[PDB]
Ligand binder design. Structure first.
Ligand code: GB7
Ligand code: NAG
Ligand code: ZN
Length: 1015
């Protein structure tokens, strides 16, 4: 195993180092506005060294943006694909690349057999080539790596089955900035090349000057370079035709033959395209070849990529003709005029890469090595695209919830083979596809129109319901005596209970367990643990009486706590935000202990009075002018008092102090230790009143944030033996700090209401001497060092926070883990901040054509981990990575993959069993079974089950935590007959494994295995 901590990789370009050195000056470079006037030696090219030019027709098809997926499919994409089929069939030298398999699958399944066969033939023959082959072309900022893999696998599995192809070149022309998580997954999915486009205009200029636009992109910790993937960065402002032929868009636009008038298009540079004729072809070729030769100067080989396309291009028959015929006339002239020393043709992306590497092998170029990322993107001036790290935060959080329900549903149902009548494969396919669709760079990014956002939400809601149906059928099967098991596949044996989604105060949707002497004495509940290690975790249920006690299925008493059910209401009468307590339902909380990848059953039982093993929380309402708060049968009266500082400690964990406004002020780790200043504060950013306006994409604040005026907010303190909390009703935010004996959990119920042109930020203020350094994660996969740069505007120092961020000095670290991707930064030493929501009246001129005024209440969740790190083995000051501790990693897992909770629906569960998976290996804490997926239907003689295994890297801080069992996924199911290592998409076998044993993976590695079973 490579050491990912102690060896700083030696690379030609390291992006944090490059950032430190660059000036980022935005000067007018001429026709290439963000570059310089390119010059070339006309004599570079000659009879023995020609420029080989590949013109690659393409059509960027967004799976939802201004229209829904289906509206675009009906109005544009079905015609593009239909006419591609006809035009490529009829013109054998014409070529076309296709990226978005969600659309291609929608189209293909509507084709007659005659046309399916024509389509297979133009793919087989190389005229139509798929690039990447994902369901979509995903966002790279907000997306979790698990879901990037999911959507890649969904599209590539479809391509292998129906088109018999697996792309090895990736095409990512539109995500707003780019992440090294992409080459990481792609290189472990068989890819050999990838292309990116949207990177900061200063980076394009800098890399172009050094001919470093093509590079071997390796991970920031990778000393050897085995993760490296060849990458092509496009050099110019856009992937459209004006910005892809060469440096001067006034010239390139004359070669977009759709822009002549009848198509309702024109050239902003005021010179139209002209049809190519025998009389003008020489002149036109001399303009175009000059553009090509200038572009060629920015790259190292004599092979040149010229994309030819734009959004939803190549629709009309007349458009296919006008592009193809004019380019054929140019190629014929250019290729026949020796003085140009060019050979130009239509080509595919793979053709371009193959020729580049032929040039490399011929010794004509060596490519530089690069590590780091390409955030935060700016396309011009100070227009940094950090706004979309937060836009539509409700769906950003929904993404993480569905991420987990997909994994759990696929896992739970993988243990058995299911009859076709069970509709298990059917429901899982719908769930995977709706989640995969939302990875699109207008989905999770929150940059689609209101009605399109609604479509994605409805689609995800259907996916959640599909997951629940699969999960609960699976649980009933796994925990019922087999000779009693009698499934109705439409029936709800269990309902899922989820405490954090949509969340209290977002949707009243949790069911109460209704118990009573005259109705039902007891109720079975079941917890599922998707992680491959034993887990204890507090779980809570709503119940109809405070007098409930908990047992396991051996009837052992389990300690429980009952609290009230509290909801916060904006009282239009008193103009206050204050809590109301239920008089009919209560919360019961207890510790569930669940096997690795397993299930555990508990029983809740009512009695007429306080049970022995159930305690009751006290509740203290702090506000001047209190009124009574009756709580039904709840046995402890609520106490009242004026606002005041408070301190709490659960178990033997940290002691937290709060301000009289209910916000954290300090954490004391142990009985002896200092009360370390850790202050939560809410602030607001506004919008500029002159110049460019913030919108869905751009963050353009009118200065540093200003404190939210809090007034005298109402504070609720609930204190229990198992769980305590402080909750406060702030303007736009009900802010809750929850304590269960370790790192606190923070929940924010965020309702920005009608505050237009406002972004609400949550900031932490500490005395950690972090300087200008902070750490943020990429796609939930790795933590990258950031350096705050005062030479850049505030918005440029915002980065994606897809799952976590931290600051540290020599002794102390604070980590904030998230349950949803949001934007954030560290704008001064000792600070962390993370945006909660943003409501923007204006459009930001990127094509969306609206502000963001469709906000809705969202429950954001966090864990907050303050730790001593002076004893940890940390990377050197020059290493570009950072690593979590054990506690912070577990805290992240608690947010993203909690225990699932199931309530038995019927009155009696005959044949119920107490546990499943007690004999599953409890793997080392840095290892996860990220994916468990049965890959065969029940008719297959040889069953196959796929696993994706991910090992993270946790700091060594002198806490052994030792003795664990080896996890061999190939023996999780009986009668194993074969075990293979595969690509992460399961589509290619890489290694046949001795003794049918899957080896565990190295830190920061991810592997896939498929076990085969003869049963
Ligand atoms: C920023 N964008 C998005 O959010 C979409 O994904 C779209 O493809 C892309 C914009 N494409 C450009 C054209 O190349 C465009 C710009 C304005 C209006 C229409 C399209
Ligand atoms: C699938 O593709 C491979 C590529 O080499 C080929 O050998 C095989 O015959 C193809 N299967 C078909 C044509 O169905
Ligand atoms: Zn796009």
């Amino acid at each position: 195993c490579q050491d990912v901590v102690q060896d700083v990789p030696n690379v030609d370009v390291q992006m944090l180092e490059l950032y430190d050195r660059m000036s980022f000056k935005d000067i007018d470079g001429g026709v290439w506005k963000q570059g310089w006037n390119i010059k070339y030696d006309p004599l570079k090219y000659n009879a023995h060294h020609k420029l080989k030019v590949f013109v690659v027709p393409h059509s960027h098809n967004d799976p939802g943006w201004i229209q829904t997926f289906e509206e675009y499919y009906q109005h544009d994409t079905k015609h593009i694909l239909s006419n591609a089929l006809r035009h490529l069939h009829d013109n054998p030298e014409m070529k076309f690349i296709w990226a978005e398999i969600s659309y291609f699958a929608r189209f293909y399944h509507d084709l007659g057999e005659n046309k399916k066969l024509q389509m297979k033939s133009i793919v087989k023959n190389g005229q139509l080539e798929f690039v990447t082959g994902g369901w979509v072309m995903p966002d790279e900022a907000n997306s979790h790596w698990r879901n990037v893999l999911l959507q890649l696998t969904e599209g590539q599995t479809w391509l292998k089955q129906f088109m018999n192809v697996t792309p090895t070149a990736s095409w990512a022309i539109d995500p707003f900035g780019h992440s090294p998580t992409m080459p990481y997954i792609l290189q472990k999915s068989g890819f050999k090349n990838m292309l990116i486009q949207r990177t900061h205009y200063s980076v394009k200029k800098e890399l172009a000057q050094q001919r470093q636009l093509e590079f071997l992109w390796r991970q920031i910790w990778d000393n050897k370079g085995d993760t490296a993937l060849f990458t092509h960065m496009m050099p110019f402002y856009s992937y459209d035709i004006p910005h892809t032929c060469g440096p001067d868009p006034k010239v390139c636009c004359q070669f977009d033959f759709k822009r002549m008038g009848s198509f309702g298009l024109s050239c902003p540079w005021k010179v139209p395209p002209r049809t190519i004729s025998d009389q003008n072809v020489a002149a036109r070729s001399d303009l175009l070849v000059d553009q090509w030769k200038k572009k060629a100067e920015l790259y190292r080989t004599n092979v040149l990529l010229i994309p030819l396309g734009d959004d939803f291009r190549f629709k009309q028959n007349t458009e296919w003709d006008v592009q193809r015929v004019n380019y054929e006339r140019l190629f014929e002239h250019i290729n026949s005029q020796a003085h140009f020393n060019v050979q130009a043709q239509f080509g595919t992306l793979q053709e371009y890469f193959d020729a580049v590497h032929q040039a490399e092998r011929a010794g004509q170029a060596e490519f530089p090595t690069l590590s780091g990322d390409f955030f935060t993107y700016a396309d011009r001036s100070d227009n940094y695209w950090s706004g979309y790290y937060t836009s539509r935060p409700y769906h950003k959080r929904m993404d993480r919830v569905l991420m987990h329900y997909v994994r759990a549903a696929e896992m739970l149902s993988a243990w058995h083979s299911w009859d076709g009548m069970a509709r298990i494969e059917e429901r899982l396919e719908q769930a995977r596809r709706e989640l995969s669709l939302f990875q699109h760079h207008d989905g999770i990014t929150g940059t689609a129109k209101t009605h399109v956002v609604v479509d994605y939400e409805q689609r995800m809601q259907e996916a959640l319901k599909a997951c629940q149906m699969v999960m609960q059928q699976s649980v009933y099967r796994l925990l019922t005596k087999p000779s009693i098991y009698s499934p109705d596949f439409s029936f709800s044996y269990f309902t899922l209970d989820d405490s954090r989604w949509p969340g209290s105060g977002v949707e009243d949707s949790r069911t109460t367990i209704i118990l009573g002497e005259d109705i039902l004495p007891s109720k079975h509940v079941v917890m599922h643990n998707t992680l491959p290690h034993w887990r204890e975790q507090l779980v809570d249920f709503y119940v109809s009486s405070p007098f409930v006690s908990v047992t396991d299925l051996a009837n052992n008493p389990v300690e429980a706590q009952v609290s009230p059910v509290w909801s916060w209401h904006h009282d239009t009468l008193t103009k206050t935000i204050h809590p109301q307590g239920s008089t009919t339902k209560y919360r019961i909380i207890f510790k569930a202990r669940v096997p690795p990848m397993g299930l555990a059953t508990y029983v809740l039982t009512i009695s007429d009075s306080k049970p022995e093993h159930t305690s009751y929380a006290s509740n203290l309402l702090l506000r001047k002018n209190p009124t009574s708060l009756p709580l039904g049968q709840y046995p402890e009266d609520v106490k009242f008092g004026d606002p005041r500082e408070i301190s709490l400690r659960v178990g033997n964990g940290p002691t937290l102090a709060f301000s009289e406004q209910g916000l954290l002020k300090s954490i004391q780790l142990t009985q002896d230790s200092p009360h370390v200043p850790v202050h939560f504060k809410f602030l607001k950013y506004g919008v500029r009143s002159h110049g460019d306006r913030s919108g869905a994409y751009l963050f353009l604040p009118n200065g540093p944030a200003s404190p939210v005026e809090l007034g005298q907010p109402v504070v609720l303190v609930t204190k229990g033996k198992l769980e305590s909390s402080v909750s406060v009703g702030l303007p736009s935010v009900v802010h809750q700090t929850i304590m269960r004996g370790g790192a606190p959990e923070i929940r924010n119920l965020v309702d920005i209401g009608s505050l237009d042109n406002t972004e609400i930020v949550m900031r932490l203020e500490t005395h950690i001497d972090s300087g200008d350094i902070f750490y943020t994660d990429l796609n939930g996969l790795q933590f990258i060092k950031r350096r705050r740069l005062d030479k850049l505007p505030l918005q440029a120092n915002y980065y994606p926070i897809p799952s976590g961020m931290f600051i540290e000095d020599a002794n102390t670290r604070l980590t904030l883990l998230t349950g949803q991707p949001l934007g954030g930064s560290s704008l001064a030493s000792g600070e962390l901040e993370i945006m909660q929501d943003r409501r923007l009246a204006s459009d930001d001129e990127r094509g969306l054509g609206q502000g963001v005024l469709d906000n809705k209440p969202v429950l954001h969740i966090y864990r907050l981990v303050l730790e001593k790190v002076n004893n940890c083995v940390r990377p050197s000051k020059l290493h570009p990575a950072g690593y979590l501790t054990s506690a912070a990693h577990k805290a992240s897992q608690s947010l993203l993959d909690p225990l699932d909770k199931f309530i038995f629906a019927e009155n009696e569960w005959i044949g119920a069993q107490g546990q499943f998976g007690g004999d599953h290996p409890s793997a080392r804490e840095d290892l996860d079974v990220s994916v468990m997926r049965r890959l065969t239907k029940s008719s297959a003689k040889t069953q196959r089950v796929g696993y994706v295994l991910h090992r993270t890297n946790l700091m060594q801080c002198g806490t052994p935590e030792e003795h664990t069992q080896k996890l061999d996924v190939c023996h999780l199911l009986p009668n194993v007959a074969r075990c293979e290592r595969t690509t992460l998409t399961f589509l290619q076998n890489l290694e046949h494994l001795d003794g049918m044993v899957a080896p565990e993976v190295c830190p920061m590695e991810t592997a896939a295995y498929v076990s085969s079973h003869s049963s």
